Ligand binder design. Structure first.
Ligand SMILES: O=P(O)(O)OC[C@H]1O[C@H](O)[C@H](O)[C@@H]1O
Ligand SMILES: [Mn+2]
Ligand SMILES: [Mn+2]
Ligand SMILES: [Mn+2]
Length: 391
């Protein structure tokens, strides 16, 4: 192998400006990092800068450097959707024609009707809501009627809440599996179905650790699958395992925050493995992008950047670090949905003694998967062009 270990970091939703097809999605004007940099009166990200972030695009406080640490460019998304699953599945070598849907007005009557008809239960709620706020509003009614609280969030999810002493866990799990089947339908294509059991009484409800997530398998065998099948390590950190429904994953490390994600990254740097370590930093999307909070987003980016010098110190000559994003989620943009954006790509190894250069723009996110696959000598994905030889 050219590289023994590849550390792939997805800064979730950290887009670098509207994609050529942004208008189709109502994303004209969108610029995640650029709008954040403006809000912050200059983003402090000196380590991303040293890697060549400003060389991709200059933004407030983010300037180009004469000798970037590694190679740099941006990537264009080819798949129809702008969601996390689409982005990650494309990164690992797929092409996804069918987008996952978001439901700001709640779910279609048709879907809920069929869910009722299959389960023998009434559905209440049917709206975007915080999980905790909807229990306060409708938890008592749920308890008294044996109905199901169905709700959504800013991303492609269908969540079913039911009290554990009213609807038995196994019944809630069966109901969610039915929901999972019904939502494999392009009329209402949902990324995840999530069981949200809760306990307690009105004014004091608690969601339990019995939460279960029902994900779809990626629409194809990914580069992770091929790595796993050739006896390589695939270490998934954070939401990664869930995003791929465990496909091609050899070890999974749960994280609770971006900082904890960077701690697990460092943990993997300390591991003797050959293969891929794959981190998702999800806070950017989950806490700041959808909530349209440029200040919190800006601060999180600065907190993330400050962690990088330790990563740089631990990388070996035969390690490659790849930093990218899966889509945009501009926190100063109308509505609550992702934004169709280019994503940055930074590729760094300490073996790059003279620093890096600009790469041709990646025409699909799958160029990452192709690069990883060529590196480890496994079956090349159907889509994507490797940049391994450019490094
Ligand atoms: O905590 P809740 O409001 O029920 O759900 C919000 C999000 O929490 C989970 O990560 C899913 O991504 C949901 O979109
Ligand atoms: Mn938009
Ligand atoms: Mn994402
Ligand atoms: Mn999201």
């Amino acid at each position: 192998n050219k590289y023994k270990r590849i550390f792939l970091v997805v800064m979730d939703s950290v887009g670098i400006g509207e994609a050529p097809d942004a208008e189709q999605f109502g994303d004209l004007g969108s610029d995640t990092i650029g709008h954040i940099a403006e809000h912050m009166n200059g983003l402090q990200m000196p380590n991303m800068v040293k890697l060549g972030l400003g060389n991709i695009r200059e933004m407030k406080g983010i300037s180009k450097v004469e000798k970037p640490l590694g190679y740099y460019t941006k990537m264009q998304e080819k798949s129809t959707g702008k969601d996390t699953m689409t982005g990650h599945w494309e990164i690992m070598g797929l092409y996804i024609d069918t987008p996952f849907q978001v439901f700001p007005e709640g779910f279609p009557k048709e879907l809920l009707d069929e869910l009722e008809e299959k389960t023998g239960r009434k559905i209440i709620g049917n709206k975007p809501a915080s999980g905790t706020e909807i229990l306060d509003e409708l938890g008592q009614e749920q308890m008294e009627t044996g109905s199901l609280i169905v709700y959504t969030a800013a991303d492609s999810v269908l969540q079913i809440a039911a009290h554990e002493e009213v609807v038995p866990l196994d019944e809630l799990y069966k109901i969610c599996k039915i929901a999972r089947e019904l939502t494999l339908d392009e009329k209402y294509m949902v990324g995840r179905v999530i069981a949200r059991p809760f306990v307690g009484e009105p004014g004091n409800f608690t969601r339990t650790p019995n939460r279960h997530d029902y994900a779809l398998k990626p629409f194809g065998r990914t580069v992770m699958n091929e790595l796993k099948d050739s006896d390589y390590d695939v270490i998934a950190i954070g939401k990664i395992s869930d995003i791929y429904d465990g496909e091609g994953v050899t070890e999974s490390l749960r994280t609770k925050s971006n900082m904890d994600g960077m701690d697990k990254l460092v943990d993997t740097l300390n591991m003797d493995f050959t293969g891929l370590s794959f981190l998702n930093l999800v806070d950017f999307d989950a806490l700041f992008g959808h909530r349209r909070d440029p200040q919190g987003y800006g601060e999180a980016l600065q907190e993330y950047d400050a962690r990088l010098p330790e990563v740089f110190a631990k990388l070996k000559e035969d390690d490659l670090l790849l930093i990218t994003a899966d889509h945009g989620n501009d926190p100063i943009h109308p509505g609550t949905d992702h934004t169709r954006e280019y994503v940055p790509l930074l590729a760094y190894s300490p073996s790059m003694k003279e620093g890096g250069q600009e790469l041709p723009l990646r025409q699909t996110f799958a160029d990452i998967g192709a690069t990883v696959a060529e590196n480890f000598g496994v079956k090349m994905p159907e889509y994507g062009t490797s940049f391994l030889n450019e490094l």
